[PDB]
Every structure is written in C-alpha cells, then in structure tokens.
C-alpha cells in the first residue's frame, strides 16, 4: 500500500510486561491531506501527493499557494509523492491518517540522515588507521595508496576516498511497529530511524514482506 | 608537485573568472538624516534607524 | 634463498624444496645460483635420503 509522512520526535523506550525493554522512536504523524492525484490518463503513472503540518501565510509563495487552493487543503510544509499500487484510490483532500498502520506490522522509514561534514577515510569508509609509532612520518590517518602503477595509470572510478558523509537520504528497512497511537497521532517504530530530531520521515509498510 | 609545462594566458585567465569582486548595491538611506549606510550598520554620523544612537 | 651478498639472493627463485609425500621428508637446496643445478643437487640429495629411510627400514 501507500505510506505516510511524519516528523521524528526523539527516542524513548517501552517496558513491556514480560521483563523486556524495547527501544522505540516516537514518530508523530499528523493528517496527510492529499493535494493531487495522478493517473495514467494524464501522467502515465498513478500516484498521489500529500502534504503535512502547517506553514505561514507570508512564507509560502504564489505558485505554491495556488497549488493548495486547487486541492482546497490547508497549506502544508512541502510535498511528498506516493506511488499508488493499483488496488486503492484516493480523492483530492482525503485526510489520510495514521489509521493505515494499525493494519500493518512492519514498516520502512526513509529520512535525510545526520550530516558529518567532510569526513575522512577512517570515518567515512572505515579504513584502518596506520601505525601511531615505529617511525611513522605525518601519515597516521591518511588513506594510504590509491592506485596501482603505470599499467592502470589512473585511479579507478568509485574509489573510496574522503568527502561528504551524511546529509543524505537513507532507508532503514523492516522496522517493527510497536504501537499505533491514533488519539495522540503517534507512531512508535522499534529501533533507530535516520535523521535528527524534528526531521521528516517517510514511513511506508515493509516491501520485503 | 611542480608543473610539467607552463599554462597559457588562457588557462590563467579562466581560473580568475571566479575571482571577480561584487558590488554591494545595497546602500540604504537613513530615516532621519537620509544618509548612505549598509544594511544593519550605523551611519557615519551615528544615526541608525532614525535614532542618534552613538551620541558621538 | 635466505642469505646476503646482494639482492641476487633476493630476486630469483633459485632455491628448491623436493617433498616426498609417501614419506614426508623435505630435501632442500640453496647451494647454487641456478635453479636447474639446485634441483639437480636436491634430487640426488633426496635419493640419498631415500637410501637411509630404506636402510632404517631394514635396520629396524
């Protein structure tokens, strides 16, 4: 089926009765109101796009405000788009809520991870640091060799080198849902999801199930 | 770590295409004395947003 | 070969080990510069060591 867009609210834990403490991530999922429905008659693929939360009146532009009045919805922060799966059908304004995940059992969470900056080869690609002593001159954490010799004569493409780490879309798969809390608009997945506290998260059910 | 042969005045010139200065174009006019200053910086006399704030 | 004098001792595969798997005795040779002479010496050296394992088979 489709998934929903929500915001990450820290981490907690749930002491279950049987003597187990399972760590949960509190994901708040407000109402995801649909702004546009797509189909093969106009687009070639059938999908919807939703929006969540709220924005200010002055911060939203003129093209984005005329796109929301087309749907009749409240203006919401950004737009995300979900591919429909040939069995369901939504309308423009159908306020999709966290009631979908009382059906499901395991989810997939996608969010922009935490950014580490220009990270070196020991941190980014898990390289072994060289020896801290025994003669070593200015070459402790440096990456070592990067190529062979005259016969390649180059560095091969895709070489594990130092650079931008994090700040990148990643999907942790197959996370258990612990509680679907519909009065509080809360989803409690089990374990760790990407991104800092307050980032966006795209929770959809487990494709590998 | 040394060059193999000298670059041209063409290859010297393209590296400096990004080295150009920008004009600020954002001089404002004071509310009281009508004088030029930067945004959020006080004037030469000492006015800022209409008020003689430096008394100097 | 293990030794010294130049990297002539450490560039060419001039040693040889002839290992006799029906017995398990390891005859080696590093005596010459050329592999073909070391293999020729170590082959005759092992046929002497196959004499002695057949003497000690008789003598036991």
């Amino acid at each position: 089926m489709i998934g929903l867009v929500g915001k990450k609210v820290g981490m907690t834990r749930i002491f279950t009765e049987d003597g187990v403490s399972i760590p949960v991530t509190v994901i708040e999922v407000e109402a995801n109101r649909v702004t546009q429905v797509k189909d093969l008659a106009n687009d070639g693929y059938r999908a919807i796009q939703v929006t969540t939360g709220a924005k200010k009146a002055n911060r939203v532009t003129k093209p984005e405000a005329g796109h929301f009045a087309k749907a009749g919805v409240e203006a919401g922060r950004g737009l995300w788009e979900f591919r429909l799966a040939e069995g369901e059908e939504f309308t423009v304004g159908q306020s999709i809520s966290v009631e979908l995940f009382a059906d499901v059992k395991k989810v997939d969470v996608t969010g922009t991870s935490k950014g580490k900056g220009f990270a070196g080869t020991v941190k980014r690609w898990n390289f072994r640091t060289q020896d801290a002593t025994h003669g070593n001159s200015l070459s402790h954490r440096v990456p070592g060799s990067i190529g062979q010799n005259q016969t390649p004569g180059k560095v091969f493409k895709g070489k594990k080198m130092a650079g931008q780490m994090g700040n990148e879309r990643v999907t942790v798969q197959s996370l258990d849902v612990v509680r679907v809390d519909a009065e509080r608009n809360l989803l409690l997945v089990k374990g760790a999801v990407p991104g800092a506290t307050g980032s966006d998260l795209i929770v959809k059910p487990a494709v590998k199930a | 770590a040394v060059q193999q042969n000298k670059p041209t005045r063409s290859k010297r010139g393209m590296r400096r295409s990004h080295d150009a200065l920008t004009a600020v174009t954002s001089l404002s006019v004071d509310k009281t004395s009508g004088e030029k200053h930067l945004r959020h910086h006080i004037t030469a006399d000492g006015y800022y947003r209409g008020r003689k704030v430096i008394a100097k | 070969t293990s030794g010294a004098g130049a990297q002539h001792v450490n560039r060419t595969e001039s040693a040889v080990r002839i290992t006799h798997i029906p017995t398990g005795i390891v005859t080696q040779c590093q005596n010459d510069r050329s592999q073909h002479k070391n293999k020729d010496q170590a082959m005759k050296q092992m046929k002497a060591k196959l004499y002695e394992l057949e003497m000690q088979k008789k003598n036991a």
């Binding site: 907690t12 002491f15 403490s21 | - | -």
Partner: protein
C-alpha cells in the same frame, strides 16, 4: 518535548522510595527460573544513581561470595518489584566509584542516623 514527556510519565511507576548513594538497599528482582516465576533478592551498596525520569537507573555493588558483583538496575522496569532501604549511608559524593579498590574494613562506610 511534550510528546515524549507525556509518553514517559504515563509509564513510570509512582512508588519509588527515596534513596541516596551510600545506602544499603535490598532490591528484589523477578527472575524466570524455567517455568516458575521467582522473585529473588539483591542486597548491596548503592554506589551510583542516574536520574532521567523514566530512564533513571541505579547501580548497586554487592560483595558476594568470592568477589564483588556490580549490578545496575533500570528503576522503572517491571523486573524490579521492591526497592527497600535497609541501611542509610553517610557519604559526601554522588558517585562511589572509589569503593572498587577498597575492600573489607576500608570499604565500610558511615551511618547517617541524623
């Protein structure tokens, strides 16, 4: 935030006895010994206390037969049935990690009795 703050204090037990570090405390812990669900006892000295609300925890050092055992307990876990202060100790430090090298007569601590 208030979402977590609400979600945690609905889960905290509301009968935790007020103990300080240095107190001899007999913590009584559920244990599943196969089929039967036994409640067993652990009596040592509280050498450390972490306070985080629901995530609060305290570490109890017990010198058992042989050598010392330093077990920590998650405070609001359902595994701890009863926490009971037996003796009240008079230290002036929030973490008693100096007590790991001290054994025996040097490991003993002062009564409060105020």
């Amino acid at each position: 935030s208030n979402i977590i703050k609400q979600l945690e204090q609905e889960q905290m037990k509301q009968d935790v006895p007020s103990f300080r570090p240095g107190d001899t405390v007999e913590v009584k812990v559920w244990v599943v010994e196969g089929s039967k669900k036994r409640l067993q006892a652990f009596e040592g000295v509280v050498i450390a206390i972490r306070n985080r609300g629901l995530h609060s925890a305290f570490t109890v050092r017990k010198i058992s037969n042989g050598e010392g055992v330093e077990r920590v307990f998650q405070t609001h876990s359902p595994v701890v049935d009863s926490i009971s202060v037996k003796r009240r100790g008079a230290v002036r430090k929030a973490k008693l990690y100096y007590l790991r090298e001290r054994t025996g007569k040097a490991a003993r601590i002062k009564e409060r009795l105020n």
